[PDB]
Structures are given as C-alpha cells and as structure tokens.
Design an enzyme around this catalytic site. Structure first.
Site, PDB file in Angstrom:
ATOM      1  N   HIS C  89      -4.074 -17.837   2.006  1.00 37.13           N
ATOM      2  CA  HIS C  89      -4.128 -16.661   2.936  1.00 37.13           C
ATOM      3  C   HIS C  89      -4.906 -17.019   4.197  1.00 37.13           C
ATOM      4  CE1 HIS C  89      -2.738 -13.965  -0.337  1.00 37.13           C
ATOM      5  NE2 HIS C  89      -3.600 -14.614  -1.128  1.00 37.13           N
ATOM      6  N   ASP C  92      -5.251 -12.855  11.092  1.00 37.33           N
ATOM      7  CA  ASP C  92      -4.932 -12.769  12.559  1.00 37.33           C
ATOM      8  C   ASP C  92      -5.403 -11.378  12.998  1.00 37.33           C
ATOM      9  OD1 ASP C  92      -3.472 -11.939  15.133  1.00 37.33           O
ATOM     10  OD2 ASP C  92      -1.600 -12.813  14.575  1.00 37.33           O
ATOM     11  N   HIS C  94      -5.256  -8.807  16.087  1.00 36.90           N
ATOM     12  CA  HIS C  94      -4.601  -8.509  17.368  1.00 36.90           C
ATOM     13  C   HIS C  94      -5.641  -8.232  18.484  1.00 36.90           C
ATOM     14  CE1 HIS C  94      -0.351  -7.190  15.746  1.00 36.90           C
ATOM     15  NE2 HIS C  94      -0.649  -8.414  15.335  1.00 36.90           N
ATOM     16  N   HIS C 129      -3.945  -8.690  10.238  1.00 36.92           N
ATOM     17  CA  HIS C 129      -3.085  -8.998   9.111  1.00 36.92           C
ATOM     18  C   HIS C 129      -3.121 -10.460   8.747  1.00 36.92           C
ATOM     19  CE1 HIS C 129       0.322 -10.731  11.505  1.00 36.92           C
ATOM     20  NE2 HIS C 129       0.074  -9.785  12.384  1.00 36.92           N
ATOM     21  N   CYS C 130      -2.814 -10.775   7.471  1.00 41.60           N
ATOM     22  CA  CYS C 130      -2.567 -12.145   7.034  1.00 41.60           C
ATOM     23  C   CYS C 130      -1.261 -12.641   7.654  1.00 41.60           C
ATOM     24  CB  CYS C 130      -2.583 -12.132   5.498  1.00 41.60           C
ATOM     25  SG  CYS C 130      -2.263 -13.746   4.737  1.00 41.60           S
ATOM     26  N   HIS C 139       3.549 -11.711   3.151  1.00 45.82           N
ATOM     27  CA  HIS C 139       2.175 -11.269   2.986  1.00 45.82           C
ATOM     28  C   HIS C 139       1.924  -9.909   3.607  1.00 45.82           C
ATOM     29  CE1 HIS C 139       0.049 -15.007   1.366  1.00 45.82           C
ATOM     30  NE2 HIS C 139       1.327 -15.336   1.419  1.00 45.82           N
ATOM     31  N   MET C 144      -0.980  -6.801   3.036  1.00 46.18           N
ATOM     32  CA  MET C 144      -2.128  -7.587   3.519  1.00 46.18           C
ATOM     33  C   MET C 144      -2.369  -7.362   5.020  1.00 46.18           C
ATOM     34  SD  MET C 144      -3.287 -11.280   2.053  1.00 46.18           S
ATOM     35  CE  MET C 144      -4.986 -11.811   2.399  1.00 46.18           C
ATOM     36  N   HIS C 249       3.021  12.912  12.871  1.00 42.31           N
ATOM     37  CA  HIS C 249       3.101  14.360  13.192  1.00 42.31           C
ATOM     38  C   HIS C 249       2.161  15.089  12.225  1.00 42.31           C
ATOM     39  CE1 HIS C 249       5.117  18.027  14.623  1.00 42.31           C
ATOM     40  NE2 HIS C 249       4.667  18.517  13.505  1.00 42.31           N
ATOM     41  N   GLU C 273       3.497  16.694  20.073  1.00 44.34           N
ATOM     42  CA  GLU C 273       3.995  17.113  18.733  1.00 44.34           C
ATOM     43  C   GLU C 273       4.050  15.906  17.792  1.00 44.34           C
ATOM     44  OE1 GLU C 273       8.171  18.780  18.669  1.00 44.34           O
ATOM     45  OE2 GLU C 273       8.342  17.861  20.680  1.00 44.34           O
ATOM     46  N   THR C 274       4.652  14.813  18.302  1.00 45.91           N
ATOM     47  CA  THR C 274       4.966  13.582  17.574  1.00 45.91           C
ATOM     48  C   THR C 274       4.867  12.436  18.562  1.00 45.91           C
ATOM     49  OG1 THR C 274       6.503  14.902  16.211  1.00 45.91           O
ATOM     50  CG2 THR C 274       6.781  12.478  16.195  1.00 45.91           C
ATOM     51  N   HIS C 300       7.525  11.466  10.877  1.00 46.79           N
ATOM     52  CA  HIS C 300       8.558  12.479  11.073  1.00 46.79           C
ATOM     53  C   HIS C 300      10.007  11.973  11.104  1.00 46.79           C
ATOM     54  CE1 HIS C 300      10.156  16.490  12.095  1.00 46.79           C
ATOM     55  NE2 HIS C 300       8.964  17.042  12.028  1.00 46.79           N
TER      56      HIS C 300
HETATM   57  O1  NO2 Z   1      -0.408 -11.356  15.005  1.00 49.21           O
HETATM   58  N1  NO2 Z   1       0.986 -11.499  15.347  1.00 49.21           N
HETATM   59  O2  NO2 Z   1       1.968 -11.357  14.217  1.00 49.21           O
HETATM   60  O1  NO2 Z   2       7.138  20.498  11.302  1.00 44.94           O
HETATM   61  N1  NO2 Z   2       6.810  19.256  10.645  1.00 44.94           N
HETATM   62  O2  NO2 Z   2       7.904  18.619   9.834  1.00 44.94           O
HETATM   63 CU    CU Z   3      -2.085 -13.382   2.568  1.00 45.47          CU
HETATM   64 CU    CU Z   4       0.689  -9.652  14.376  1.00 45.41          CU
HETATM   65 CU    CU Z   5       8.516  18.981  11.850  1.00 46.42          CU
END
Ligand code: NO2
Ligand code: NO2
Ligand code: CU
Ligand code: CU
Ligand code: CU
Ligand code: NO2
Ligand code: CU
Ligand code: CU
Ligand code: CU
Lengths: 334, 334, 334
Positions: C89, C92, C94, C129-130, C139, C144, C249, C273-274, C300
């Site tokens: 493992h 990384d 970001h 993430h791995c 992974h 992960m 949402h 809303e979303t 949603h």
């Molecule tokens: O961290 N880039 O998959």
């Molecule tokens: O109104 N939320 O599905």
């Molecule tokens: Cu891993």
């Molecule tokens: Cu990444």
């Molecule tokens: Cu909704």
C-alpha cells in the site's frame, strides 16, 4: 406579519413547456400564492415504437407544471389524490424548509386531499417531486416531478448587477425512464403496480435508462410542438432533472447567462456552450437569439439525445446575419 | 467593417497534443484566419491488445487539431472530403452562431469540399464536431471531434483582472469509444460501414464505453510521447470531451486557475484538485510546476483512467524542493 | 524558516463521521502537525443482506479519518503497514505537491512503515487515497480513501469576505463498491486477493457500482448513529468521493454556502438545493438548521440513495416554525 392579513392570489397553471402568467419584478408586497394540482396515474406512450408505461403525474403531464412565485411569498398548495388512482403519493419541494420539503405532511391516499403552506425564502429554480417512504425512486422515475421558480422581488440580474429581462420563458423537464426488459431485450408489461414493483426495482438498479425524454415522450418538443422565438428575443429556458445529471446545449447558440445549479443570488456563468445540471436540480439559461432557422436543444451526451430521446427543437423567425455566419463556397465537387 | 478589407492569415495546423503558433495578446486588429482540414476515414489500433476500429477523423488524428483565433476574428474553414472516403460528413462549431454551428451549411459527400466563415464573438475553448442528421453520435464517437480556442484580444486574466501568461500549451482530447461486443464479451468487426451501423447503435445505447482514451489510443501520451515541462513553467492544458462528462486531475499537482466549462469572461476557479468538464464542452487549466519528476494526468474515475485508457504522463525537469515535500523516514522494517 | 525550529503538535484521530479537535482560526503560527495511521485489511459487511467484502482501510474505517490542518502548516504522517496485512500500500494526498501526491515515496510492504512530510500550501478539503502502480482503482474502490481539510489561517469566509463559523462538523465519505457477480446476478466470494483480482477488474470495467454507501455500509448513518443538530446551529458537512461523481442534497434543507469542488479561496455558491462533487474531489456545505425533525442526506440519484445505499439521516432538536412551513389542512377524505 400575520399571514391572514396578506393578499391571496389564485394561480391557474398551464401545461409544460409553457408557463403561467407572472411579473418578473414584483408588483405587490408579499402574497399567499394559491395553487391546486390533481394527481393522475395514466398510461403514456413514450417513443415512436409505441412503448406504453404507467406514468405517475402531477396535473396530467410529465413533467408537472412550472409554479412561479417571488422570494418571501407563501406557497399554498392544495394537492388532490382522486379515488380513480390506486397509490399513495405526496410532494417534496426543494424550495421549502422542514418536514422533508413537505413530504412528511402531504401523504394522501386515493380519495384524500391536503393543503400545505411554506415560505419561499430562497430565490432560484427548484425541483419538486413525489417521495413516499420506501418507494421514492419508483415514483420520481415514473414521471412524478416538476419545478418551481422563486424570482427575486426585483427580477433577474447579471454578473454586474444590471437587469436581465426575458421576453419568453419555457420549461423543459427531462425524464429518465427504466422500462423493464426481458433477457432478449424487449420491454415487459404488467397487470398491476404491485406485480410490476420488483422488476421496476431491478430495472432501476441497472442505473441505465431505457429512455431519456423532454416533455414526456420522444419528439414531444418538435413539429407542431417545436419551441418558437424571433431574432432579437430574450428567452429563459428552465431545465430540471430530478434523478440524473444532464448537460444541456442549444445547437447553433449558447447560454449567454446560465445558473447551472439554478440559484439567483449567485452571478451567472457567461457564454456557456454546455453546462452541468446535477440530478436533483433545476437550472436556467438566458439567451438572445441572433439568427433565424431551426435549432436543436439537447442533452449533449449525443447518444442520450439522438438515440434515447433527449432532444427538442426551436423554430426561429427573422433575418439572416451573414457577418455572424455565411457559406463562402457551398458544397461542390471541383 | 467590410470583411474584404481585413487582413487574411493562413494557419498551418499541427497534430495534437501540440498546438499551432499564435500570440496570446493580439498583435493586429481583427483578421480573417484561414484554416484547411481534410477528412480521413482510417483504421486505428486503440489498445494494447490490438483492437482496430474504423475511425472518422479531421486531419488524420483523434482528436482533430486545436484551432486558435482571437475574439471578433473571422474563422474561415475549407473542409475537404476526398473521394477515398465513403461517408457524408460536416462540421458544427460550438464557438459559432447559427445553422447548427455550421453543420447545416457544410454537408460534403466524398469528392466535395466547402468553405464556411463565422465570427468568433465569444472568448473560450469550444468543441467542434461532425454531426450529420440521423447519424450524429456515430460520427462523434468514431473520433470526429476536436476543439477551437478563441482568446480574449488582451490574453487571459485571473480572478482579480491581472494577466495570466502561459509558457507552453497542450491539447488533450478525450474519446469514449463503443466497440460492439458479442454475448461472450469479445469485440466484433465488420466489412462495411452499413453492415456495422445497427450494432454501433446497439453498442452506444448501452451507454457504457469500452475504451476512454487520450490522443486516440491507450498510452498515447506516455513514453517517447509523454508531455514535458520544467520546474517554474506555466502550462495551459486544454481538455475536451464531445459526448461524456470527465473529471481531470494532475496527479502530484493542481489546476491553479481552471475554467472548467471553458469560457474566459468568467473568473477561473482556484486551487482545484479535480474539476468537471461536461460532455459537449472544452475546459482549460493553468498550472505552474513546482517539482520535477513524473506526473500522471487522468480522468479521476480511476477505472476509466487505469483500466479503460484515460491516463497520460508529464516528465518534468529541474530541482526537487524538500520544503514542499520530503521523505522523512524511507519505507523500512523496524 | 528552518522546519526544526517550528512547534510540533500530535493529533489523535477519531472515527468518521466525527472529526478530531481543531481551531477554525489559527491560534499559533505555522506548525508541523503529526499524524499516525495504521493500514488494516479487514472483512466488512456492507448491506442488510449480509454481503461481506475484503476492505482495505486507513485506520480501520471506510472512509479513512478526516485530517485537519491550516494553510502553510506541514503535515507529517507516519504510515504503518503491519505484518498481519498481505498487500503493498501507499498514500497520495491531493493536498500535496510532487511525487504523485506522496505515493511515489510511501510504498510500504507488510511489516514496514514510513514517514512523509509535505507543506499544505492550498486551502480546501481534498481527497487522500492509496494508489499502488498497476492496482490503483482496486485499492480505492476497496475503501482505501479519506480526506484532509486545510483551513485558511483566518477561518472560513462568505462570498462577501465576512466570517463563516461552524458549530459542528461531520465528514461523509461516499464509497462505490463493485462486488463481482455471477451470470445469475449473485455475488461471488474468493479465497485469496490474487484469486479475486481478475474478477475485481472485470466487475470494475462494467462501470456499474453494486453498492454506494456512506461511512462504509447501508444504513451506517441512521438509527443510533444518525447525525445530530439543534435548531439554530451552524453545520459544516465535508463530503468526499474518490472515484465517481456524486450530487449531495439535504432533504428538507439546503446548502446555504457550498464549495462544491472544495477550495476555500473561491467564493461559495449560495442557496444550493443539490451540487456536483466530481469523482476524485472533496466538497463542503455549510447550513444553519431552521426546523426540528428528521432529515435525510442523500446522493440525489435517488436510485443510488434508496436502492444502493447512499442515504443517511439527521435528527434535529428544537421548536417548529409554522411561518416557514405548516399543514393548513391535514390529509383527509372530504
Ligand atoms: O491522486 N491521483 O489519483
Ligand atoms: O427532496 N429530496 O429527495
Ligand atoms: Cu492500498
Ligand atoms: Cu487521486
Ligand atoms: Cu429531492
Ligand atoms: O453542436 N451540438 O451537438
Ligand atoms: Cu407519487
Ligand atoms: Cu463525420
Ligand atoms: Cu455539439
């Protein structure tokens, strides 16, 4: 302020893609705006092959009609479930605050009605949809969704704070359907909603729509029902998708000002080719037409547009501008 | 101004991911910028297994080349369909206004050519693609798409209005392919385009790509064809996807300024890890490299990147900065 | 400044959805913030049917815990791979710059550990993430992945530059799983990771998740483990998705201020809303609760929420506001 002291105004809704009458800039103080919708379970033919489903509708249409109010109005909705229907339904407004958007307060069996009120505290376009506990995606993906627009009291504004006023408005509701298929690929049909339910759940769990349509059917916004405009007119297109992302595009035009996620306190994005409306959202695009002719308005997954149904047309009247575009040498062998 | 009075300049295009010569800040007034592209139907091997498809290209490449102009220039394109091809083609520019982006005016049978002019009235990066009525997604998903950049006349600006000047530019076109499969999962091949068409439509309607690649094939932007830069260089990466959403990410870096939906009148988003380019759109990301070594540039659906093909590399030269990152204790048993 | 002269502070992490203690506005100058995580390969039951997978975790949880620092702190992570594990493992970030986010410097076999340091130069929420070369999506989609928050030194700000201070914070990690299925549709199980690998690759290449869950399992953020708040409290919900888009949402509420792509130098979107969090990204939403009761918090795509697992709940205490929402006429036959 005591709500019984406010003016009441009754709205009479129209079928999409048209929108009921309203004023962009509020001509009164805050009001109680009264709406009525009647639930209708009905058969609908959704494609050119004749595929027929059991749709679940607000007011007889997919999508349900566009409701329009101003910020800090009260929306008061009388929701009727006639005894000719067979299922329990309700309504959740993404514009509203509390009780699952209203869904916890609006559960109506066939032969019942209810009246909900909520304060429209946030400006924007928003989804509304049915959402009965335990069968939410079935109702939504059977067509039981629409949208509400909550305008700022002083109308729409651009990225610099100046007014934006539309001449015409349309509402495009986009619907992903999951019609169950047998192993060979043909659609099944069912005798009762209960006998259909497991295979509707199975079809939905594939995550792959069988149809993606505007205004309830392949081709609905074409021919005698194409959208219209004239050169120089300002048009607002409200677009909703209650369950899946979409990527609208006006073929031959642009979104001059776009609220992709639909909320008018934010400045719009300018000059868009295509924009992302997330599933569960309404968005809105403003455009001033510059050229006459036919345009297509699509989801720009072009498979979804031209094979699964997510395409409509505008017919635009007026004079052609050769400075903006011209054929210098028409197609020819030489 | 009468267009015949303007300067004409002829562009000579280059193969992606490289970009033809241009100036960020316009060194002349508005011009008629002349481009020529020749359509080529050709076989292409798209993966390490040797899978070969019939691609439909502008100028021999997937994607087609990047065209570059300034806002309020005129684009004049001579589009040639040689008689060695078998199909009808055209071109739609998302940068253009009217006639389906040009598609209604540019329909060319094998052995024909045409010349289109349009005014580039909006600044940004935009998709162009073939779109013949009734067979639009087939042409686009056979590789027949590219992009055009319309720079502001005074070059790019940051969120505060100050200049942003790139040292290098690359164009990454990302292509979703739908190669038809038999029931056991193996790709089929076909003797003529007509004999292929129903199964291409069937494959597309699954909505599931078989391959998602940069610059036309698995691994195309790696090895001897990795992208390059030096520590301290400012790089603009233009990225297009004509049919499906993508989510670009520079592994080991960022998008310091990103126009995710590609339109330069909007302020860029700062400090992005990953951004959403909707299907049907071009986007652009600006980054200043700070560390040497290998980077990968991916669609961050990591299945799509590392199993289906949507991954390329940068090789970056210069000195390592231990203040930004260091191994304090190298991997060891203890 | 010489790093050995800076203060060191040791963090003790907590299990999601909770978040370790921190101060929004920095109470010290820049620090070296010390974290330790232990990799754990473990069986996890992910649904109500009892489906059991082999998960790959940071610190025993899916997602891994939320780490919190300020801009221009140094993150120093001791990563331990005990000899009870069987696989290689790495990690990384970001948030980090160089060496594939740290992945090229942190490759640990069972029985090894390593310590990485990086400067957190950009404010926002970010995925970690791995990512082992050649087996990255396996992974990540085995669980992960987690997230790190890098706060501005002067805390969060609204679209006008005024402070935004949360009272509570939660971290929702959303996980797409690809459990291999036989031809009849039932999940398979496997005796070793190597015997599983080809069918994991096959399952991933369908691009269709079998499960999409919050905090590692269907129903994890419900019942005795529902999220909580009181009327009037300000809540920040950090949400990550390391591999696929999501569309969060709050059912019954909104995102009052949302950084959909997670980076705090940008102004937030208001009144959502979303919103769309692209795969490979962390986002954050701030809301002030106005009504008591149960809320659901969902992806949603309502199929993904209510059939595949992407739904949790809030239980909110306090007084009901009938001005914001009321039942005028409760459901009844009449
Ligand atoms: O961290 N880039 O998959
Ligand atoms: O109104 N939320 O599905
Ligand atoms: Cu891993
Ligand atoms: Cu990444
Ligand atoms: Cu909704
Ligand atoms: O150029 N619209 O598909
Ligand atoms: Cu219903
Ligand atoms: Cu073509
Ligand atoms: Cu297009």
């Amino acid at each position: 302020v005591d709500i019984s002291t406010l003016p009441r105004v009754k709205v009479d809704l129209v079928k999409p893609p048209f929108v009921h009458a309203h004023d962009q800039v509020a001509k009164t103080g805050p009001r109680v705006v009264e709406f009525t919708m009647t639930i209708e379970e009905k058969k609908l033919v959704i494609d050119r092959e004749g595929t027929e489903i059991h749709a679940m509708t607000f007011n007889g249409s997919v999508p349900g009609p566009l409701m329009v109010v101003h910020e800090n109005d009260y929306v008061e909705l009388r929701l009727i479930n006639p005894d000719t229907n067979t299922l329990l339904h309700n309504i959740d407004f993404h514009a509203a605050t509390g009780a699952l958007g209203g869904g916890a307060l609006t559960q109506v069996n066939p032969g019942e009605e209810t009246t909900l009120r909520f304060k429209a505290t946030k400006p924007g376009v928003f989804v509304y949809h049915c959402a009965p506990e335990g069968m939410v995606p079935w109702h939504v993906t059977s067509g039981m969704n629409g949208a509400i627009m909550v305008l700022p009291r002083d109308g729409l504004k651009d990225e610099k704070g100046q007014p934006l006023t539309y001449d015409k408005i349309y509402y495009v509701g986009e619907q992903d359907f999951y019609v169950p298929k047998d192993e060979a690929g043909n659609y099944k049909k069912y005798e009762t909603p209960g006998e259909a339910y497991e295979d509707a759940v199975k079809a939905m769990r594939t995550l792959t729509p069988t149809h993606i349509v505007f205004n309830g059917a392949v081709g609905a916004l074409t021919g005698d029902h194409a959208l219209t405009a004239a050169v120089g007119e300002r048009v607002l297109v409200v677009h909703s998708q209650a369950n899946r992302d979409t990527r609208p595009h006006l073929i031959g035009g642009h979104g001059d000002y776009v609220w992709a996620t639909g909320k008018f306190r934010n400045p719009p994005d300018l000059d868009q080719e295509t924009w992302l409306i997330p599933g569960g959202t309404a968005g809105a695009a403003f455009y001033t037409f510059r050229q006459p002719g036919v345009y297509a308005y699509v989801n720009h997954n072009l498979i979804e547009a031209f094979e699964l149904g997510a395409a409509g047309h505008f017919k635009v009247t007026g004079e052609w501008n050769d400075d903006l575009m011209t054929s210098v040498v028409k197609p020819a062998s030489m």
